[PDB]
């Protein structure tokens, strides 16, 4: 969570960790068949009715926000309206991220194109070289 505002932010060059060694271990055929399809399958299964993931994330987000406010030592009001507004905002953000992965393109494009775009972005050497030294972007 961002120390300035109560929001979810990763702020890293790549969306997730997929380095050359893991790709080689999986192989091209497996990476094309299993890895790409399973992410979309999970997203589609979870967000079938859109009014369930939010109900599941409500309490977790509430706890996270309360912890952030307590750590900042700046509650000073325990205002329920602010809590509700920010909790709803964070739940909406997470659900938007979940819904992005489970969308089928419009033209004659494959079913999982967003996942392939994410994989390309996460394997691009240009932005794979901007990670920290401890992250070990290589290997």
């Amino acid at each position: 969570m961002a120390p300035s505002r109560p929001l979810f932010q990763n702020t890293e060059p790549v969306p997730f960790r997929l380095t050359p060694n893991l790709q080689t271990l999986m192989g091209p055929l497996a990476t094309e068949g299993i890895f790409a399809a399973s992410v979309m399958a999970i997203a589609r299964c979870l967000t079938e009715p859109e009014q369930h993931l939010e109900h599941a994330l409500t309490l977790f987000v509430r706890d996270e926000m309360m912890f952030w406010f307590t750590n900042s030592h700046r509650t000073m009001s325990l205002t329920e309206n602010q809590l509700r507004e920010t909790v709803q905002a964070n739940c909406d953000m997470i659900v938007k991220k979940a819904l992005a992965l489970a969308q089928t393109p419009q033209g004659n494009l494959p079913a999982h194109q967003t996942v392939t775009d994410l994989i390309a972005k996460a394997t691009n050497p240009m932005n794979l070289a901007l990670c920290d030294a401890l992250w070990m972007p290589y290997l």
Binding site: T24, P28, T31, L109, P110, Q113, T116, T123, P125
Partner: peptide, 22 residues
């Protein structure tokens, strides 16, 4: 390029880790 090779790239395919890069 190189027909019937699994290392070819295509905007609708993953890069494959046996080529320099697309």
């Amino acid at each position: 390029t190189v027909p019937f090779s699994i290392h070819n790239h295509n905007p609708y395919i993953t890069p494959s880790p046996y080529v320099p890069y697309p």
